[PDB]
Paper text:
The main/3C-like protease (Mpro/3CLpro) of severe acute respiratory syndrome coronavirus 2 (SARS-CoV-2) is responsible for making 11 out of 14 cleavage events for liberating and activating the viral non-structural proteins essential for the virus replication, and accordingly, it is an important target for antiviral drugs (1–4). Clinically relevant SARS-CoV-2 Mpro inhibitors, including nirmatrelvir, the active component of the Food and Drug Administration-approved drug Paxlovid, and ensitrelvir, which has been approved in Japan for the treatment of coronavirus disease 2019, target the cysteine protease active site of Mpro to competitively block its catalytic activity. Multiple studies have identified an Mpro mutation (E166V) that confers strong resistance to clinically relevant inhibitors, including nirmatrelvir, but the underlying mechanism is not fully understood. Glu166 is also hydrogen-bonded with the N-terminal Ser1 of the dimer partner to stabilize the Mpro homodimer and intramolecularly with His172 to stabilize its active site.
We also determined the structures of Mpro E166V/L50F bound to ensitrelvir at 1.65 Å, Mpro E166V/T21I/L50F in complex with bofutrelvir at 2.09 Å, and wild-type Mpro in complex with bofutrelvir in two new crystal forms at 1.68 and 1.91 Å resolution. To investigate whether the difference in the positioning of the indole moiety was due to the amino acid substitutions, we also determined the wild-type Mpro-bofutrelvir complex structures in two different space groups at 1.68 and 1.91 Å resolutions, respectively. Thus, the variable positioning of the indole moiety was not caused by the E166V mutation but rather seems to reflect the flexibility of bofutrelvir binding. Bofutrelvir binding to the Mpro active site showed significant variability in the positioning of the indole moiety. This observation highlights a flexibility that allows bofutrelvir to engage both the backbone amide nitrogen and carbonyl oxygen atoms for hydrogen bonding without clashing with the substituted Val166 side chain of the E166V mutant. In comparison, the presence of a saturating concentration (100 µM) of nirmatrelvir, ensitrelvir, and bofutrelvir greatly stabilized wild-type Mpro and increased Tm to 71.5°C (ΔTm = 18.5°C), 68.2°C (ΔTm = 15.2°C), and 70.3°C (ΔTm = 17.3°C), respectively, reflecting the high-affinity binding of these drugs (covalent for nirmatrelvir and bofutrelvir).
Numbering used by the authors:
A (entry chain A): 1 to 301
B (entry chain B): 1 to 305
Amino acid sequence: SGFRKMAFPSGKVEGCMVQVTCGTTTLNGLWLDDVVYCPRHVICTSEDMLNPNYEDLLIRKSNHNFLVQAGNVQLRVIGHSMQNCVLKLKVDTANPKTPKYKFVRIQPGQTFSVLACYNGSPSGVYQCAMRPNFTIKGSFLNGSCGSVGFNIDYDCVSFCYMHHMELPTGVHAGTDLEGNFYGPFVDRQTAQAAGTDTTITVNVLAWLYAAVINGDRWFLNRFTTTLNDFNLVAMKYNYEPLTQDHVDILGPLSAQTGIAVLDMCASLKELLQNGMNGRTILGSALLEDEFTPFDVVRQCS
Amino acid sequence: SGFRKMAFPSGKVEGCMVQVTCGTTTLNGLWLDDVVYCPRHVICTSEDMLNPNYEDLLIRKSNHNFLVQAGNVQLRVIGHSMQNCVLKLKVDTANPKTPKYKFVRIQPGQTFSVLACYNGSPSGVYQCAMRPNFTIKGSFLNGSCGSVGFNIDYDCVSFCYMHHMELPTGVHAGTDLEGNFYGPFVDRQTAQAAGTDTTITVNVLAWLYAAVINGDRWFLNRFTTTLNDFNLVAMKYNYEPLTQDHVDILGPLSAQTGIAVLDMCASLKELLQNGMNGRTILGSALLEDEFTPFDVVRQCSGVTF
Ligand SMILES: *C(=O)[C@H](C[C@@H]1CCNC1=O)NC(=O)[C@H](CC1CCCCC1)NC(=O)c1cc2ccccc2[nH]1
Ligand SMILES: *C(=O)[C@H](C[C@@H]1CCNC1=O)NC(=O)[C@H](CC1CCCCC1)NC(=O)c1cc2ccccc2[nH]1
């Protein structure tokens, strides 16, 4: 029993982190086979922050302008190319610690683990979710760029995020491992603002199911709702719409607990109206939205 | 910026986990040098949960009664002995992935990372605190016994916890790696209950400092207090007493933020007596007590291992 925000074990990713330096900029790179992936803004200088022409900047670089270090060993860059907003540095040696892996682009509401790194070495590991507005609420300082987010279902590592920047409101933006940003952001230091953050409704419902599984029932009620009436209410609290896909996805948890999905929606509606009245759910006094239905099933069984 | 409940990177520990099976029971072991450590209750049968004399049951057991598997390779057990509530199985080969390590016993209020494992395979990692009542509020299912808790300092892994059991209230109990239980618990099938828990005051204060460092400042005020005055309020609200050592340890954070400890104590006193009035701190609607002062320092300065 118990319920914790649980990350994946980080060892398979730790063995892939390296340090990449270009000019005076140092950040992290991901070394898989004979390629090191890192944010392309490592090639920017202090005058190229607003409107960098990355194709023009990259063509001027030599292989030896990139210093790549794995532990106390320099890797020799033998080639470079850019794919969207990531740089791919070809090196002369394959990483012997490369795990089984794939690159996956995730949808808002999906969760993943982040291995926060500085100078190629790990600082710590934590869980994150892709917010509906395509930001993540991370913990990242200067030098963290190039840290990755990942899931490890099975023994396969699915890389889904690479860190690039912090928006003025304190949240974070980045790309997939093909170099495409999540959301409308660009790798320029120009004024950019994320959409209004909303709550990930299907994840709140998953977490209420987790609470029942762990023995807690105080928030249940005798009512039900239609899906359309639920959405009319939840949007007034800046909750994301719940779709029929979401209802289908909660079928398994509904079957395990004997609580129909639309009956749990009626519980959530009352919680939004009443608050918690000095109570907690799974040790929280707010409704958590960073556990997916899949996460709940992994942890509770 | 930002602030998250952050676990230590687990790679150094993952390479030490193995599976240990005795009779019908399977759980995890920790393989360091040429010894595998696991809970001694692995030896119990259904007719020994009630009241077992493990020292008598261990004589009856022979080396080949312990199946140890590291991945798909079987380790050969060449000896066995007990240390308190931990079984030590000597194996014929040293773990080539053994990290620099030591065994340490932690104090209540200290935090550590748990590598939850099943069948010898690491499954997830999260940060815990040793509660004042000597339990931990973990997430553990059947087959997780022998999962371990650890801290890392530079290149050194300090192992501090091995998991043994779940109490009726759903919190968890275990031992250090020399097999001494944390708290007034025993490894017998019997009625056991956690003591009433209290909140870790020095950790709440550290987290309030983390909040200010991240620009969350609504709870600060003009007032200050004394230790005696504060501690009288603490006792009233089931908070752990705040000592002078605690004030000293927060010293850094006080100087960095310009909020003296007793100044921040006056903030915490008001939060206790008045609550949060519908506001949050670092995304929480409760006062969080599972970050130590050192936890805050290393997250806010980007310390690596
Ligand atoms: C890479 O290591 C950092 C990671 C940042 C530092 C603070 N927290 C983080 O997550 N990335 C940056 O510093 C980028 C660099 C830019 C180079 C040119 C192309 C765009 C990215 N900058 C920022 O994240 C940045 C600058 C800035 C100024 C004012 C407010 C916010 C802000 N964020
Ligand atoms: C080891 O893998 C498990 C871990 C437990 C399973 C559920 N959650 C956990 O953390 N440990 C056990 O199952 C122990 C075994 C005992 C054998 C005899 C010596 C003491 C340990 N049992 C329990 O944890 C247990 C039994 C029990 C009965 C009623 C309420 C709670 C309860 N916990």
